Amino acid sequence: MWELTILHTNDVHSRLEQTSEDSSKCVDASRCMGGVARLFTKVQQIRRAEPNVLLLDAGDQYQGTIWFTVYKGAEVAHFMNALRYDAMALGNHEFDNGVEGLIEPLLKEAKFPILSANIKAKGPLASQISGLYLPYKVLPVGDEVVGIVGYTSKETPFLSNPGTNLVFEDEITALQPEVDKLKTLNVNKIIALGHSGFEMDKLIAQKVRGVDVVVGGHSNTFLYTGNPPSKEVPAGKYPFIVTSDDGRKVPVVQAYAFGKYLGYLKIEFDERGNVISSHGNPILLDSSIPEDPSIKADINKWRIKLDDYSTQELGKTIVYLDGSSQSCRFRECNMGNLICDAMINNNLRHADEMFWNHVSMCILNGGGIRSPIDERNDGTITWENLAAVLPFGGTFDLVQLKGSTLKKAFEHSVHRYGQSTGEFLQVGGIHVVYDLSRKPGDRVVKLDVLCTKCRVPSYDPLKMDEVYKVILPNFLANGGDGFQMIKDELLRHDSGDQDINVVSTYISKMKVIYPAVEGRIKFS
């Protein structure tokens, strides 16, 4: 039998350094997790112990801390090379700085193949980018060869900045003839590695004949067999087994996000490449694993340039600033309240003619909030802390909407509630109540809004046929996260200030902050 060890990461999102266990900045060093130094130690240990090992990344290394703000992906190429990754698939965040921001820092510097079979280049772009990413790579592993075929979320154009000259084809349609090619080349072991989300991963496993294993990402899925070692709750066993339409058992794996875990799957193949068995579990990268001293020293080197985003205290928090996805995608979270209060404040700083100009209302996609902040380091808030919460460089815009437009937005907010999706709205100037037992599109059972046409602001039931001034991310003003109604029906859009500056100025002005969860969003 020939045994393959697959070690995999996904949605690392610029956590080059170890982190608190909620993936924010490490403060209590003795209990930190993740980071590429600790990852290295563990991979090294596994490579000593197992003869056939591949280390794979399923995309979304780009975007998430000051590391990326500053080094713009040059840190990704540098440290992925140091860890000796064997292959990476392109994720949507790889395109955030446009194709140019992927070509120059990453594709031209990586020492391993970068993959995606469903991304097709056209127009003036097709010539530059040719050869820089590949549909697949066949890799020698010991005496054998393993084919890796890449794929990338078909909805990257609605998520990132890939430009007008790249086409994202259906993953299953694009993947099949590549896997078919590999088979005619007599490659009988085939891993599909890519970045479309666990639901698409399962369908690729089901539908692409010849795929032996799927290694995926994008949905930050945590899978586990046995008693999970930390706060993440398993969505299924590890590996998750899909039975293909031609009858094969196909393991499907993902390993959460932020470099907190290393996925580890061992696959037993026979000499024809049939999977006899597989097993494993993600490995929690906690402090019981030591940080490699070489990689850590090189991280400390690179870190020097990052220190002046932590040089100044902006303000303090005396409460935990809960920007976790498990809160912000599911209920009112105090990081979302703080941000909306800054957006409204920033506006109502230049307002009042009367009953108009006053904008009283804010909404904010909870998935746009990308990290918590911890109150325990004497509670200091720095530019670096804020940059991990708001890494996209968006702006907070003013939009005018109808009551009816807004009610449909709130129905959209919870239309598929329960899947940790980013559309769930955090708010200010708005008291919404949902009843999730009702049907999608009919779950909003109360929606009050803060009058602006009044001398004392108080909450009144929203009116379907009235018009309202809402502050919200440009992401949302453009129909991001499926808020088609907003793009389609707004009656006015104006651009606003940079997101991080807004929140930063607000914090500096308050000096000490303490946002509560206060019943702006309730469930019936």
Ligand X SMILES: Nc1ncnc2c1ncn2[C@@H]1O[C@H](COP(=O)(O)CP(=O)(O)O)[C@@H](O)[C@H]1O
Q: Per-residue x/- mask for a copy of itself, residues 428 to 467, rule CB under 8 A?
A: ---x------------------x----xxxxx--------
Rounded to 5, what percent of the chain is helix, strand, coil? 30, 25, 45
Q: Per-residue x/- mask for a copy of itself, residues 327 to 356, rule CB under 8 A?
A: -------x-------------xx-xx----
**Rounded CA gap, 151 and 262, in Å?**
21
Would you say 396 is a known binding-site residue?
Answer: no
Whether omega for the bond prior to residue 239 falls within 30 degrees of 0, making it cis, is: yes
Stretch that binds ligand X, among 239-247, 313-321, 362-370, 381-389 (CB under 6 A): 362-370
Q: Which does 74 bind (CB under 5 to 8 A by kind): Zn ion, a copy of itself, Cl ion, none?
A: none
**Shortest spacing between CB 333 and a copy of itself, in angstroms:** 8
Stretch that binds ligand X, among 104-112, 168-176, 365-373, 443-451 (CB under 6 A): 365-373
**Rounded CA gap, 76 and 84, in Å?**
12
Are the C-beta atoms of residues 248 and 226 closer than 8 Å to each other? Answer: no
Q: Which of residues 208-247 bind ligand X (CB under 6 A)?
A: 218, 220
**Shortest spacing between CB 366 and a copy of itself, in angstroms:** 15
Residue 11 within binding range of Zn ion, rule CB under 5 A: yes
Q: Which does 368 bind (CB under 5 to 8 A by kind): ligand X, Zn ion, Cl ion, none?
A: ligand X
Three-state DSSP state, 514: coil
Please say whether the dihedral angle defined by the alpha carbons of residues 486, 488, 492 and 493, taken in this order, is positive or negative.
positive
Would you say 11 is a known binding-site residue?
Answer: yes
Residue 172 within binding range of a copy of itself, rule CB under 8 A: no
Question: Judging by beta carbons within 10 Å of its beta carbon (0-12, 13-18, 19+), is residue 461 exposed, middle or buried?
Answer: exposed
DSSP code at position 291: P
190/369 with CB nearer ligand X: 369
Are the C-beta atoms of residues 341 and 329 closer than 8 Å to each other? Answer: no
Residue 319 within binding range of a copy of itself, rule CB under 8 A: yes
What b/e sequence results for 393-410 when a residue is b if at least 16 CB atoms lie within 10 Å of its CB, and e otherwise?
ebbbbbbebbbebbbbbb
Residue 192 within binding range of Ca ion, rule CB under 5 A: no
Would you say 292 is a known binding-site residue?
Answer: no
Which of 8, 11, 18, 43 is the binder for ligand X (CB under 6 A)? 11
Both tokens of 268, joined, read 């037993």
**Shortest spacing between CB 516 and a copy of itself, in angstroms:** 4
Stretch that binds Ca ion, among 169-177, 206-214, 244-252, 295-303 (CB under 5 A): 206-214
Both tokens of 389, joined, read 């919460």
**Shortest spacing between CB 428 and a copy of itself, in angstroms:** 11
- For 450, list phi and psi in degrees, rounded to 5: -80, 120
**Shortest spacing between CB 285 and ligand X, in angstroms:** 19
Question: Judging by beta carbons within 10 Å of its beta carbon (0-12, 13-18, 19+), is residue 150 exposed, middle or buried?
Answer: buried
Residue 214 within binding range of Ca ion, rule CB under 5 A: no
Comparing CA positions, the residue from 170, 104, 185 lying closest to residue 139 is 185
| Total chain residues near Ca ion (CB under 5 A) | 3
Q: Which does 212 bind (CB under 5 to 8 A by kind): Ca ion, Cl ion, a copy of itself, none?
A: Ca ion
Q: Which does 519 bind (CB under 5 to 8 A by kind): Cl ion, ligand X, a copy of itself, none?
A: a copy of itself
**Shortest spacing between CB 60 and ligand X, in angstroms:** 5
Give helix then strand counts, H and E, for the chain. Answer: 16, 27
Q: Per-residue x/- mask for a copy of itself, residues 487 to 516, rule CB under 8 A?
A: ----------------------xxxx-xxx
Residue 275 within binding range of a copy of itself, rule CB under 8 A: no
Rounded to 10 degrees, what is the CA torsion of 425, 429, 433, 439?
-50
**Rounded CA gap, 93 and 380, in Å?**
29
Q: Which helix (H) or strand (E) holds 405?
A: helix 403-413
Edge-to-edge, what's the strand order for the sheet holding 430-434?
A: 459-461, 444-450, 430-434, 521-523
Would you say 270 is a known binding-site residue?
Answer: no
Q: Which does 273 bind (CB under 5 to 8 A by kind): Ca ion, ligand X, Zn ion, none?
A: Ca ion
Terminal alpha carbon distance of the chain: 56
Residue 273 within binding range of Ca ion, rule CB under 5 A: yes
- Binding footprint of Cl ion on the chain (CB under 5 A): 197-199, 219
196/337 with CB nearer Cl ion: 196
Are the C-beta atoms of residues 222 and 235 closer than 8 Å to each other? Answer: yes
Are the C-beta atoms of residues 5 and 215 closer than 8 Å to each other? Answer: no
262/361 with CB nearer a copy of itself: 361
Cα atoms in the 13 Å half-sphere on the side-chain side of 420: 16
Are the C-beta atoms of residues 79 and 15 closer than 8 Å to each other? Answer: no
Contact residues: a copy of itself, CB under 8 A:
318-320, 322, 334, 348-349, 351-352, 358, 375, 379, 431, 450, 455-459, 509-512, 514-519
Contact residues: Ca ion, CB under 5 A:
188, 212, 273
Which residue positions form the known binding site for AMP? 329, 365, 370, 392, 475, 481
Which residue positions form the known binding site for IMP? 329, 365, 370, 392, 475, 481
Contact residues: Zn ion, CB under 5 A:
11, 60, 91-92, 218
